[PDB]
Curated annotation (Swiss-Prot), chain A:
The gene is IL17RA. It is linked to Immunodeficiency 51: A primary immunodeficiency disorder with altered immune responses and impaired clearance of fungal infections, selective against Candida. It is characterized by persistent and/or recurrent infections of the skin, nails and mucous membranes caused by organisms of the genus Candida, mainly Candida albicans. It comes from the Eukaryota. This is Interleukin-17 receptor A. Widely expressed. Forms heterodimers with IL17RC; the heterodimer binds IL17A and IL17F homodimers as well as the heterodimer formed by IL17A and IL17F. Forms complexes with 2:1 binding stoichiometry: two receptor chains for one interleukin molecule. IL17A homodimer preferentially drives the formation of IL17RA-IL17RC heterodimeric receptor complex, whereas IL17F homodimer forms predominantly complexes with IL17RC homodimer. (Microbial infection) Interacts with SARS coronavirus-2/SARS-CoV-2 virus protein ORF8. Glycosylated. Receptor for IL17A and IL17F, major effector cytokines of innate and adaptive immune system involved in antimicrobial host defense and maintenance of tissue integrity. Receptor for IL17A. Receptor for IL17F. Binds to IL17A with higher affinity than to IL17F. Binds IL17A and IL17F homodimers as part of a heterodimeric complex with IL17RC. Also binds heterodimers formed by IL17A and IL17F as part of a heterodimeric complex with IL17RC.
From Swiss-Prot, chain B:
It comes from Homo sapiens (Human). Interacts with IKBKG/NF-kappa B essential modulator, with CHUK/IKK-alpha and with IKBKB/IKK-beta. Interacts with TRAF6; this interaction is direct. Interacts with IL17RA and IL17RC. Interacts with IL17RB. It is linked to Psoriasis 13: A common, chronic inflammatory disease of the skin with multifactorial etiology. It is characterized by red, scaly plaques usually found on the scalp, elbows and knees. These lesions are caused by abnormal keratinocyte proliferation and infiltration of inflammatory cells into the dermis and epidermis. Candidiasis, familial, 8: A primary immunodeficiency disorder with altered immune responses and impaired clearance of fungal infections, selective against Candida. It is characterized by persistent and/or recurrent infections of the skin, nails and mucous membranes caused by organisms of the genus Candida, mainly Candida albicans. Widely expressed. E3 ubiquitin ligase that catalyzes 'Lys-63'-linked polyubiquitination of target protein, enhancing protein-protein interaction and cell signaling. Transfers ubiquitin from E2 ubiquitin-conjugating enzyme UBE2V1-UBE2N to substrate protein. Essential adapter molecule in IL17A-mediated signaling. Upon IL17A stimulation, interacts with IL17RA and IL17RC receptor chains through SEFIR domains and catalyzes 'Lys-63'-linked polyubiquitination of TRAF6, leading to TRAF6-mediated activation of NF-kappa-B and MAPkinase pathways. It comes from the Eukaryota. The chain holds residues 398 to 419 of 574 of the full protein. This is E3 ubiquitin ligase TRAF3IP2.
Length: 48, 22
């Protein structure tokens, strides 16, 4: 008989870098609000 | 609303009309 002492099997486990991983970022455009005095289209009429 | 007046010079105020009798 032989003993597995020296030849024992190996388990594996990755060295995950999640602890130092950057996050996913969401973008939102800062709308030029119409609540603030934004301009409007100058629909014109004629006084005949 | 607000009022407005055009700066259209007098030279651009000339118009010509072509038509038929009916």
């Amino acid at each position: 008989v032989r003993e597995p002492g020296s030849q024992a099997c190996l388990a594996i486990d990755p060295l995950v870098g999640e602890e130092g991983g950057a996050a996913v970022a969401k973008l939102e455009p800062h709308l030029q609000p119409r609540g603030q005095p934004a301009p409007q289209p100058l629909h014109t009429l004629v006084l005949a | 609303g607000t009022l407005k007046t055009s700066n259209l010079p007098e030279e651009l105020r000339k118009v010509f009309i072509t038509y038929s009798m009916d």
